[PDB]
Amino acid sequence: KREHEREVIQKAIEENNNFIKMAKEKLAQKMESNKENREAHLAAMLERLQEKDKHAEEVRKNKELKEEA
Amino acid sequence: MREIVHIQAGQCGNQIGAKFWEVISDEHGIDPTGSYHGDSDLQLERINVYYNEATGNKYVPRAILVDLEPGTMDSVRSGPFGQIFRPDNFVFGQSGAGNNWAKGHYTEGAELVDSVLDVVRKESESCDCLQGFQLTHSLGGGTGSGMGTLLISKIREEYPDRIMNTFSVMPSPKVSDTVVEPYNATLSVHQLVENTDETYCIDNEALYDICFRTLKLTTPTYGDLNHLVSATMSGVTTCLRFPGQLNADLRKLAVNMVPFPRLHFFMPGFAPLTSRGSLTVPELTQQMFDSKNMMAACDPRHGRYLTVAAIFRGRMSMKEVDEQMLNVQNKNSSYFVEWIPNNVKTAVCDIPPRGLKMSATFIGNSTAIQELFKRISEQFTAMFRRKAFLHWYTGEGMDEMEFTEAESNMNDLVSEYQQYQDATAD
Amino acid sequence: MRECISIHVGQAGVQIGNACWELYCLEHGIQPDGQMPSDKTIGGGDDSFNTFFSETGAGKHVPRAVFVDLEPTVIDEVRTGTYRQLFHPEQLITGKEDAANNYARGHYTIGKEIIDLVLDRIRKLADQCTGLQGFLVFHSFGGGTGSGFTSLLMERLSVDYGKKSKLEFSIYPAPQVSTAVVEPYNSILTTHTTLEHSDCAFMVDNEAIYDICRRNLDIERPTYTNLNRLISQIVSSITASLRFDGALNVDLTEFQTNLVPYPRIHFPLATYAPVISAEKAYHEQLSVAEITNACFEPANQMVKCDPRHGKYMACCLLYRGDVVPKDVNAAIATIKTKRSIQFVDWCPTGFKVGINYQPPTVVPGGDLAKVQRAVCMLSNTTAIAEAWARLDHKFDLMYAKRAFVHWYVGEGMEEGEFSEAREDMAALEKDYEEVGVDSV
Ligand SMILES: Nc1nc2c(ncn2[C@@H]2O[C@H](COP(=O)(O)OP(=O)(O)OP(=O)(O)O)[C@@H](O)[C@H]2O)c(=O)[nH]1
Ligand SMILES: Nc1nc2c(ncn2[C@@H]2O[C@H](COP(=O)(O)OP(=O)(O)OP(=O)(O)O)[C@@H](O)[C@H]2O)c(=O)[nH]1
Ligand SMILES: COc1cc2c(c(OC)c1OC)-c1ccc(OC)c(=O)cc1[C@@H](NC(C)=O)CC2
Ligand SMILES: [Ca+2]
Ligand SMILES: [Ca+2]
Numbered sequence: 001k002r003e004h005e006r007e008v009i010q011k012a013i014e015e016n017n018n019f020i021k022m023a024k025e026k027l028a029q030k031m032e033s034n035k036e037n038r039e040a041h042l043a044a045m046l047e048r049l050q051e052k053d054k055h056a057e058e059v060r061k062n063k064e065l066k067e068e069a
Numbered sequence: 070m071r072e073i074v075h076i077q078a079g080q081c082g083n084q085i086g087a088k089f090w091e092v093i094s095d096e097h098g099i100d101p102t103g104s105y106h107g108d109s110d111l112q113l114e115r116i117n118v119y120y121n122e123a124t125g126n127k128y129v130p131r132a133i134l135v136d137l138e139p140g141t142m143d144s145v146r147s148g149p150f151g152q153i154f155r156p157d158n159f160v161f162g163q164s165g166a167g168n169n170w171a172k173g174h175y176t177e178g179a180e181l182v183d184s185v186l187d188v189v190r191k192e193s194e195s196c197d198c199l200q201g202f203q204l205t206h207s208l209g210g211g212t213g214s215g216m217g218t219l220l221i222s223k224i225r226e227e228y229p230d231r232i233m234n235t236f237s238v239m240p241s242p243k244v245s246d247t248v249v250e251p252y253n254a255t256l257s258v259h260q261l262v263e264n265t266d267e268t269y270c271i272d273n274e275a276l277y278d279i280c281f282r283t284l285k286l287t288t289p290t291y292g293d294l295n296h297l298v299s300a301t302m303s304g305v306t307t308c309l310r311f312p313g314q315l316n317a318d319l320r321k322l323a324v325n326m327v328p329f330p331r332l333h334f335f336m337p338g339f340a341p342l343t344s345r346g347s348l349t350v351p352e353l354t355q356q357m358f359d360s361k362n363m364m365a366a367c368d369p370r371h372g373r374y375l376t377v378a379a380i381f382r383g384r385m386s387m388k389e390v391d392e393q394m395l396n397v398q399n400k401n402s403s404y405f406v407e408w409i410p411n412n413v414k415t416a417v418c419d420i421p422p423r424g425l426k427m428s429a430t431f432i433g434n435s436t437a438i439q440e441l442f443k444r445i446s447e448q449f450t451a452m453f454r455r456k457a458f459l460h461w462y463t464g465e466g467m468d469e470m471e472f473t474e475a476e477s478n479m480n481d482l483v484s485e486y487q488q489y490q491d492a493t494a495d
Numbered sequence: 496m497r498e499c500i501s502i503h504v505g506q507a508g509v510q511i512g513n514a515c516w517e518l519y520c521l522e523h524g525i526q527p528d529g530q531m532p533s534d535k536t537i538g539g540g541d542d543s544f545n546t547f548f549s550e551t552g553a554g555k556h557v558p559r560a561v562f563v564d565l566e567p568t569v570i571d572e573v574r575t576g577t578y579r580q581l582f583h584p585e586q587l588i589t590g591k592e593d594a595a596n597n598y599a600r601g602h603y604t605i606g607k608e609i610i611d612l613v614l615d616r617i618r619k620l621a622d623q624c625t626g627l628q629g630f631l632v633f634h635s636f637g638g639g640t641g642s643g644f645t646s647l648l649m650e651r652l653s654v655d656y657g658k659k660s661k662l663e664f665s666i667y668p669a670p671q672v673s674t675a676v677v678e679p680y681n682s683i684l685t686t687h688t689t690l691e692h693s694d695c696a697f698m699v700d701n702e703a704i705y706d707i708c709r710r711n712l713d714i715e716r717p718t719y720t721n722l723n724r725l726i727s728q729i730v731s732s733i734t735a736s737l738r739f740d741g742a743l744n745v746d747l748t749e750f751q752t753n754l755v756p757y758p759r760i761h762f763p764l765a766t767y768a769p770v771i772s773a774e775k776a777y778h779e780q781l782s783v784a785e786i787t788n789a790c791f792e793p794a795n796q797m798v799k800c801d802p803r804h805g806k807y808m809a810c811c812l813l814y815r816g817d818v819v820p821k822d823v824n825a826a827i828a829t830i831k832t833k834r835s836i837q838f839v840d841w842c843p844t845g846f847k848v849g850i851n852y853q854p855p856t857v858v859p860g861g862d863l864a865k866v867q868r869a870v871c872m873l874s875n876t877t878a879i880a881e882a883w884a885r886l887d888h889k890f891d892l893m894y895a896k897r898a899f900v901h902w903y904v905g906e907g908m909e910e911g912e913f914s915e916a917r918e919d920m921a922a923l924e925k926d927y928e929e930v931g932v933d934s935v
């Protein structure tokens with residue numbers, strides 16, 4: 001009985017211990033995947049500013065080449 | 070704590086922008102000198118939102134004034150509130166754009182855009198927590214449209230997490246005979262679909278028709294048209310400028326008004342609209358949803374509402390307001406999309422506007438707005454089929470392909486509006 | 496010491512906390528400055544009211560509470576309000592920008608900036624506790640802070656405090672009471688994220704309290720103050736057992752063990768009786784058996800649903816005031832004879848009862864009349880699934896077209912979290928059907 005009374009408390013500790021780690025780990029990846037996702041959503045906006053600026057320069061070049069009279 | 074930075078470009082943008090400041094300064098008890106001469110403490114509880122606190126108990130609009138023709142710069146200084154504006158924030162060119170979108174967007178406006186961003190950056194640095202920008206401009210001109218849309222992109226580039234709002238005026242043959250206006254509007258709409266979070270469609274055809282038919286103004290002027298604009302602009306910003314049980318900002322408005330990123334073109338409305346030669350809450354409610362009171366030349370009963378926001382102003386029975394918004398909603402159930410539950414919210418403000426005991430301002434995201442874009446697309450295709458005046462923009466370095474891209478994108482926007490207009494719950 | 500730390504998150508949670516701590520002070524005789532003349536145990540003590548209040552050497556009784564909001568407007572009123580010096584500056588936490596009705600902003604974007612600070616202040620309160628019992632978390636489903644940051648906080652609290660009790664008080668949205676179009680999304684996301692971290696959640700349908708205030712109290716057009724004062728009566732009844740000494744009161748552990756049959760089925764339906772105005776209370780007294788019967792009338796539930804069409808799994812009846820055991824036992828005896836009140840067949844004994852002889856207290860200004868016997872019933876009924884169903888339907892209408900979803904993806908979320916959260920809700924609805932089915 002003593003041996004069983006002690007398996008119980010040691011198991012109860014393990015219950016609480018794994019509760020913490022299923023929470024620490026699940027919250028860990030949710031913040032990881034959210035970091036990546038917003039980094040991608042901001043890395044895509046670094047490519048639209050790049051293309052928008054690049055096209056503006058192509059326009060200003062075309063004006064330049066049209067002044068050659 | 071939630072500061073908005075106002076920018077206004079072009080002639081139209083500055084005239085309506087000036088009236089906006091001539092209308093809300095009175096509501097907040099600020100005279101042209103910038104001194105507070107009000108009675109209620111509620112006028113100042115959110116003075117920050119649009120005004121900077123200066124030494125000597127002075128209030129200065131957080132406004133940036135722009136145009137490529139320096140003449141309009143002096144016109145504002147001569148205005149009733151001309152001297153309230155911070156003189157450093159006047160950024161003007163020397164040539165003007167001649168109703169050329171390319172000049173304002175790519176060549177001449179580009180040479181001035183950086184000088185404006187410096188004024189934008191200075192005002193932003195003195196904000197406790199910048200909540201967004203608002204632009205007032207026309208889409209048919211050359212500067213407010215071409216340079217205004219360029220500015221939006223550059224501000225979005227530097228402030229990607231700030232909300233971009235605009236009060237965009239688009240052309241109507243009834244108010245302007247300039248021929249290339251469909252080009253400037255179509256080209257600017259191509260930008261606004263991508264770089265603004267929420268845009269109010271101030272349609273000059275709707276403003277003319279309201280002035281002529283409803284107000285009985287055989288001869289309407291920009292002052293008559295701008296009176297409707299200032300009243301609308303005062304209404305849609307009432308909850309940003311005054312406190313209450315709402316406590317909302319520009320991002321909350323966008324979050325709850327825009328179900329899909331591209332469909333952010335609103336359809337303002339105002340009530341009452343009555344002639345000088347001639348009110349109950351149920352009458353406000355009915356007229357507010359009437360097509361004749363819309364600032365966009367569209368019939369909401371030709372489409373369906375995705376979302377709606379109604380702001381009631383003046384001291385009135387709260388329960389009477391809630392009952393009537395229920396009555397109008399279920400009596401118009403068909404014109405509200407069934408797949409967005411509770412898509413009509415109502416805010417109420419005790420302070421009425423000048424000269425009225427009660428006011429109602431309407432902000433609707435309706436699929437009927439497509440009627441506007443179809444009107445411009447029809448005009449655009451008429452000139453673009455024959456390349457009329459196209460050399461104006463090619464000479465500045467543009468490609469005919471960019472014209473078709475702006476055309477097709479606006480045509481796509483019409484399709485998307487029609488897509489969700491026909492959508493069913495099951 | 497059996498202390499309890501209150502956490503008030505977002506506008507609703509803060510404003511609901513304002514009404515609760517106001518009431519607590521009135522029930523315990525604590526002045527707005529924190530001084531309590533009747534307390535002779537200066538600087539400390541083992542009194543029951545010390546479970547919610549800490550003492551300072553200067554005789555100042557300080558709430559064991561943390562107020563967090565991502566924008567300062569609401570909590571600023573507390574900092575300048577009538578109870579400004581009741582709290583400590585460290586306990587009133589605010590950011591500069593709110594979550595903008597976006598769960599994602601409250602959970603991922605604006606929340607992260609402040610979450611580590613909030614835990615530290617909660618940590619500071621915990622270190623002052625000798626026997627911390629659990630956390631009480633007040634928040635709305637609809638707001639971006641109340642939904643997104645609360646979820647973040649609950650997850651973090653499970654890591655830093657393990658299985659320590661965490662109870663919620665949640666405001667279920669309603670069109671009547673200043674709701675927003677995306678609030679169904681926030682409610683589903685926060686419920687799914689918090690299901691596995693909360694041991695007992697007390698939803699309050701804002702439409703139900705709107706109706707009670709508008710009907711029982713003859714308030715044509717209720718305010719948040721009218722609603723919060725009513726909510727505080729339920730919160731007070733639940734925590735009275737902890738803030739007051741008594742031989743027949745129900746502590747939190749006793750409270751949770753007798754009301755939650757399965758971990759996920761932990762959403763009791765709250766009722767309060769009598770909710771009555773002064774004009775009606777004039778020359779009118781209601782008895783123990785009368786207020787006991789009112790608890791089972793669907794018209795008084797804090798959440799709109801029909802217990803008559805569902806099954807009870809456990810009932811907790813917290814009496815307070817001039818209530819005697821004999822009347823309590825007779826009133827409950829009658830309820831067990833009523834075939835109109837059906838218990839599941841696996842709940843042969845389904846009543847937890849308690850009495851707190853401290854009389855109900857009314858805010859001087861609060862529409863409730865001062866009564867002498869009140870009862871708050873908290874019942875785990877399957878009917879509560881009706882509230883989940885209504886909200887789940889609104890989620891489906893919008894999500895079928897992916898309306899508004901872009902606002903959440905822009906802040907880093909994936910559509911997978913939307914469907915996952917919806918599937919969890921579907922399992923919960925099926926769970927409530929399974930527990931209601933008769934046994935073999
Ligand atoms: N409602 C309203 N519309 C105006 C006003 N002023 C000009 N417009 C409209 O604006 C269009 C022309 O654009 P403008 O703003 O004048 O041109 P701009 O922005 O100054 O650019 P550029 O003239 O090319 O330098 C016309 O279609 C007018 O109908 C005004 O005060 N109120
Ligand atoms: N009962 C009650 N409900 C409230 C109160 N304040 C807000 N609510 C509810 O909360 C919802 C709005 O969310 P809030 O809690 O105000 O928003 P928040 O937590 O501050 O988060 P943000 O989005 O950042 O503003 C509405 O649906 C209301 O029904 C209140 O004082 N009492
Ligand atoms: C700028 O101040 C405003 C801000 C907002 C709103 C609004 O219209 C009433 C405003 O007045 C201009 C608003 C928009 C409508 C919504 O649904 C379409 C919603 O749920 C959301 C509402 C507002 N929330 C409530 C409960 O009214 C928040 C966003
Ligand atoms: Ca004209
Ligand atoms: Ca003591």
Ligand SMILES: [Ca+2]
Pocket residue numbers: 531534536537538539550551553554555556
């Ligand atoms: Ca003391």
Ligand SMILES: [Mg+2]
Pocket residue numbers: 079080136137138165166167212
């Ligand atoms: Mg000009």
Ligand SMILES: [Mg+2]
Pocket residue numbers: 505506566593638640
């Ligand atoms: Mg808030």
Ligand SMILES: [Mg+2]
Pocket residue numbers: 742743744745746749
């Ligand atoms: Mg006991």
